[PDB]
Amino acid sequence: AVSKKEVLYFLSSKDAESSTAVKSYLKSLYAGAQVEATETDASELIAQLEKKYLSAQVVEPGVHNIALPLGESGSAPVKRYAAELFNLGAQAGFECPFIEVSKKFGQETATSETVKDVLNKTKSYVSADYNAALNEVLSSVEAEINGPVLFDGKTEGFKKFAAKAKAVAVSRGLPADTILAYCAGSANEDAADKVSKEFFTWFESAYTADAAAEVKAIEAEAASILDRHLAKPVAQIRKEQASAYASLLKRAETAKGAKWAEKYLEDVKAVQWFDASVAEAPASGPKVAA
Amino acid sequence: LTTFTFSGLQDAPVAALSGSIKLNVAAKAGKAEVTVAAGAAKAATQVSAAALRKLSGSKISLAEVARISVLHSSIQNYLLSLSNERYQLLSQWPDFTTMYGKDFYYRAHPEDLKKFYDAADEYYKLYETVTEFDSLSALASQVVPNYAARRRSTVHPAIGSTVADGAFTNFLLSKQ
Amino acid sequence: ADAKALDELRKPKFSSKYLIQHVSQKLIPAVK
């Protein structure tokens, strides 16, 4: 069953086999059971690790329930896809991706007092053609002063770096002024509304552009693998896919007792059930009890 | 949906717009005379404004019954929609069976006739392999794992490069 | 037999979800 910390993550999720375990757990608790006390232990390394490996169990079936908008007209299918991914991140325990990757920046570079190391420690989390563009202005300012630019905020070399970093940021196509006006704010809420209605416009354009980039990459991968598949004879294709199916069945049932293997074989039996119930009556689809 | 909704018998659809099913209601003070008539069959009941707000109590929650996944069905749908585009250009192939006669055999150069018969065999290979539609369900299982690994990010499922660059400009152009 | 359910047919099948559990039930008891 569940170890009572998985069932706490599965309450907000709306995928099927998490909601089934939640409903079975509270059906057990209704018929005279006691809820276990949560462990008030397991210091923050263990807590972040099992938070990661428990949010993965909410992301992983939720990703497979989100339809890709491959080959669609407009932006609203991409907005649907990004909205489903955002609600999945909310149900998984993540916050907004702006908040989350800013937390990642503040976590990874809590000690970096140099702008060179805050560029060379967030190198995995920013685009390489923007890390290069910021290293350009970094080397330009440290060649102007012949002194290292420190990550202080009130060193004047840092401001002479940021005065060109904001220029390359608005040259990249993102309004840094509206982003800073949202993440700092003002006093009067009618001006906070006026900067939020531009920050969220940029934010929507950015996450739908990134979701459309992921969709275009999936479309190119599918087109490439189909045009590699359409060049073969049919017998080669059939024996290739039959050998792959045999290998992936062997890799499942040679290791028995593990829960993933029995779940894999229950899923292949469920696919065979789907094929049987479609072959029973193809006009009515699969037989769903109601 | 949310818990309560606020729609029904107020700024409602009063008529239908298609001919395959026609509808008329009676915009009275409290109640409604609904008249539905789709083609041959016709039904009529009466519903009140307090009865349409009782409708959204227990939610429908439509969900999809897929063979493997909704993700896998979307990738297989795109593979089928690309296979249709390849099939559409294997559909304008010129008819070679109108040049199989012996009055075309013995007028032609031997190597060009061998090329013609190999071209017909090539079309048969291409047409037998573009209509192997039972292989798309195993092709779409190769786009799934790398994509799903890309969505198992330590930051967020929906994190991109542009959002991360904007938040890095927020992280850098502030103090510390 | 046939006509199983709806909440059993809503399950995405070949998502991982259990190699994640096979790791995390053999990592967190091993890293604590």
């Binding site: 995995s124 | 190769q142 799934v144 | 190699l19």
Partner: peptide
């Protein structure tokens, strides 16, 4: 239709590496 089950995380944030266009359509037109 089986996919190999993976349990791994992507730590980095990368552009998703769009693959170049396959040359099948002009080859079939050829």
């Amino acid at each position: 239709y089986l996919a190999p089950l993976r349990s791994d995380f992507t730590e980095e944030i990368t552009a998703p590496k769009v693959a170049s266009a396959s040359n099948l359509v002009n080859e079939w037109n050829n």
